[PDB]
Amino acid sequence: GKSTYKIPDFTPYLKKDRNTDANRLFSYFMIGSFGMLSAAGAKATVQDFLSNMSASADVLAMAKVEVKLGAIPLGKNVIIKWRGKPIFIRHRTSEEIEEANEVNVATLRDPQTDDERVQKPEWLVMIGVCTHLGCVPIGEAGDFGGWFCPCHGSHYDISGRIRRGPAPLNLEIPEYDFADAETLVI
């Protein structure tokens, strides 16, 4: 009404324990719970929502591609589509296999011998996508006369091992089985 030093009555609102740590802590428990549910909610929202961009159910459909081998002459490479990625199938000659078995495994970005790669020396089966950034190497070209990725100039071997250029790994080998000796499934 008049004196400004008589603070208005605040007793209906004032907490007696206002200066305790228990008092602050309770309010922060509320703010923290709200932060915790916001964080759980955010994570759930972002996770579920962004998953729309992951491969849809219709895309996730597996191939099991079967290919003949009678067709394929010596000294040739085929390209079989499998899961949209190309599969290089080369019918390697005896002297090609020999050439592959030569390179000391020691000096190979990705050290592997042909024996590890093929399950049958006459059937180099690889996922024909370059391990650098993902082009498909042009076969028979190169400098190690296997495959050469034209995109950034990485050279693969007759084992499809990387020899020169940015590609870090050797051309991946799919899971393939010879059901017959004349047909493989991938």
Partner: protein
């Protein structure tokens, strides 16, 4: 009698000095934990994160070892 005040200038850079920064080292630690916890929490859904990180944790790790029975899996 004292002829001159006795002091050195501590090395400093962009107005940070080692005394001050050393007091904040713990706090970066906690914020790094918060970033670690938070980042790992964000990618908990990523299958690789379960496979390689979360399923390896003792006791708790079994939360992330779930196999869909092959009877109910079209893929």
């Amino acid at each position: 009698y004292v002829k001159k005040p006795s002091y050195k200038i501590v090395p400093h850079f962009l107005g940070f000095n080692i005394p001050t920064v050393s007091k904040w080292i713990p706090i970066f630690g906690i914020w790094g934990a918060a970033a670690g916890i938070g980042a790992l929490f964000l990618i908990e859904g990523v299958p690789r994160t379960r496979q390689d990180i979360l399923s390896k944790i003792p006791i708790i790790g079994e939360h992330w070892i779930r196999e869909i029975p092959a009877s109910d899996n079209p893929f």
